[PDB]
Structure formats: C-alpha cells, structure tokens
C-alpha cells in the first residue's frame, strides 16, 4: 500500500497565526494520467470529514483561501493561515492515485487560547443510586485551558485513588476550552461510613488547588 505519514501528531496554534502540517508518502503517487491525487480532509469533533484540498493544491468548493496545499514527489504540506477557532479537529491527508486508497494517521490541531481556570462543581450520590447499593460522587471541571489538569479526591481528608474515572470533552470550537468529569464510585456501605468528600483541582492557572467539598453530616 501507499503509506502516508503525518507530522506532527498534534499542533497547538493561537488564533490568527499560521499552521503548517506535513504528509509524507512511501512512494510516488502520480497516477497513470499524470495527476497527483493527494487530498486533505478536516474531521471536526463528532462530525464526518470535510474535504479541503484536492489534487495537492486545489481548494474545494466552499473552502477559504487561507487553506493552501503544496508538494510533489513524496512530501506534501497543508498550510492554514490566520487560524480560526472552528479550524480545530484532526487533519488527514488522503490519496486515491493507487488502490487501495489510504489515509495518513492524522494531525490534531489545537487552538491555543489564553489560560483559563476551571469552574468546579461537586455532586453527592443521588438517592436513586443509593437504592441500588452504589454511590458516585461527581465533580465537573468546566471550560478550562490548557487540557492538562489534576484532580485529587479526598474522603475524610485522606486521598482516595481507587474508584476514580475521568473523562475529557474534545476542545470546544466556540471558546477553545476543555471540560472534564471526574467520578468517584464507592459502595453505598462504604460511602455511609465517611463524612467529607472533596475534589481538589490543580491547574496551571494557580498554585493553590480549587477545592469543592461537602460533609454528609451537613
């Protein structure tokens, strides 16, 4: 097969700045008719891919001129000028000069906005969940940047590491932030043998953690 190798894997770029990503092929991809059928697609989070560039350098219908493609031989480049928030997602190069058609491995474009601290909210187990014998404490850490963040759970002031499950959203195309959900799950029995439940969020935006807590004894 024609192998397409994309670099970098991910690329943080601020709004208004230029992004440049490379696609390298394992062989020449000149079709028998003389054309080089290398394409660039953008797949935004949760959507199907959108075609940006075809035949190396031609802009597809409805694609702005700040997307430009170049290359020949085995080296191809997509340049994105004056990046906008809606440009985030995974960019793929693609070839149909040879069967089987193949995709590159993708390059994730990340919008580098100004740092933002999370809004943190803590939630005790629902009464419904307690009737099934389980107990989940949830902390949402919402609309922050950059993505890296650390959540520490404490039960009665002692750090708890077992039973934590964390999940991050994709980058938001409107405000360029991330959000994450942290769920600490215990049995109902163990939950009712303790008083205080705390999630502490440590983030680049401050040297002190953001602390949200509740006491079962209220």
């Amino acid at each position: 097969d024609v192998l397409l190798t994309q670099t970098p894997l991910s690329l943080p770029v601020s709004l208004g700045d230029q992004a440049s990503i490379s696609c390298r092929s394992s062989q020449s991809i000149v079709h028998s008719n003389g054309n080089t059928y290398l394409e660039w697609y953008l797949q935004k989070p949760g959507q199907s891919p959108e075609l940006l560039i075809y035949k190396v350098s031609n802009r597809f219908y409805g694609v702005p001129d700040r997307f430009s493609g170049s290359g020949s031989g085995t080296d191809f480049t997509l340049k994105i000028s004056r990046v906008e928030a809606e440009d985030l997602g995974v960019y793929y190069c693609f070839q149909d000069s040879h069967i089987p058609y193949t995709f590159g491995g993708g390059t994730r474009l990340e919008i580098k906005r100004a740092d933002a601290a999370p809004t943190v909210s803590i939630f005790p187990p629902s009464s419904e969940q307690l009737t099934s014998g389980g107990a989940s404490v949830v902390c949402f850490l919402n609309n922050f940047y950059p993505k890296d963040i650390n959540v520490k759970w404490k039960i009665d002031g002692s750090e708890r590491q077992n039973g934590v499950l964390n999940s991050w959203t994709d980058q938001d195309s409107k405000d360029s932030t991330y959000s994450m959900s942290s769920t600490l799950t215990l049995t109902k029995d163990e939950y009712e043998r303790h008083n205080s439940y705390t999630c502490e969020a440590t983030h680049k935006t401050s040297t002190s953690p953001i602390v949200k807590s509740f006491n079962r004894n209220e």
Partner: protein, 217 residues
Amino acid sequence: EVQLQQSGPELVKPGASVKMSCKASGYTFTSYVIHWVKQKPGQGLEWIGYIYPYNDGTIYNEKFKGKATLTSDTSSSTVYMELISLTAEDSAVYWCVRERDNYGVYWGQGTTLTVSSAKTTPPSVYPLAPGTGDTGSSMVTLGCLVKGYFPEPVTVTWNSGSLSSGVHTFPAVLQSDLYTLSSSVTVTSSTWPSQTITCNVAHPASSTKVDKKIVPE
C-alpha cells in the same frame, strides 16, 4: 438535498456477521459510487471499498477481501456492507460516503458496530443536583450520570434539545463491560429550579428512553 441515511448501531457476537445499510436520496442513484470507510479509535480512517450502483461493480481494499462484501439495490436506492467472521478488531464506526461532485462530499451519519459477547444492559440515569447548603448566584451547574449500560451509543439532550448551550456531555468510558457517561448543563440561577430542567437519555440498543427531571435536594 443529497442525503445518505445509515442503519442503526449494532452489537454482534464474535464469529457472527452483520449487514449495514446506507439509503441514498436527492440525486440519481446509479450515477455515483458509494464508498465505505472504517473509523476505529486509535486507527484513524481506513477505506474499505466502493460499489457502483449502475452496474454493481466493486473495488475492494485487499485488506477487507474475505471480510467485507458490498451490494447495491437500485429499486430501493440503498447500498449495503456485510462483514463476516467478526472480531473485536471490527468494532468501529462505519461511514458510507457518496462520490463527490462540485458541491460537496456526502457522508452518511455513521453506524457504530460493537463486536462483543457482553450483554446489552440498559442505563441507570442519576440526577446531579447541588448538595444541601452551598453556593448561590449567579449560574448553577446541574448534571446527569448515565451509568452501567452496554453497548454504545447513548445520546443525552436537555429539555428535549431546548437547552443546548452550556451543555457538556462527556465521552463514555468502559469498565468491566459497562459504560458510564455524564453530562453537565449550566443555566442562569433564574432558570432553575423555577423552570424544569430535564436530561433526556436514549439508549437505542435496549429500546430505552429516560427523562430525569433535576429537583433540588
């Protein structure tokens, strides 16, 4: 308007087979080939092959010969992909996509295939309301915890979609053959609890819809 409409999500046991459909409308069905594309987490995008409805001619990625079979039925304007001898490696989102013209490239909405011996399990939907005695003005964040279901997908909306901004629905995570997902919504304090806030959870695999109104604790 060109539309490709794919069949719903599927859970199939290893070793069995599945057939997925892609119904085309809004153009001359025999004029364009339809491709199938595999999107497996961690593995980018992969082209499987295409079928030309005009004459049922097919071109396959050699990797999927003996795995995928494409067929076409012009009288119903539908193409199909059948996958046999399924393994966990076949778990993926599968897209159909119509050969482009000058106006666009036309993708179906995708079909999520899970290959597993684990059992379909409906979700438990838990309301997330602030604890008693805390916070105040001027916004309030609520949520729903959707726990213990299998397989994917689950969809979550808030107030039947009327609440769309300020919503964060978090990707599900699989533990011990059951998924857990959560969704938060942030509204002005003047909205809740004065007006109703309800998370709507749908789990097609178990034929389940749950509405959970968020009530103060």
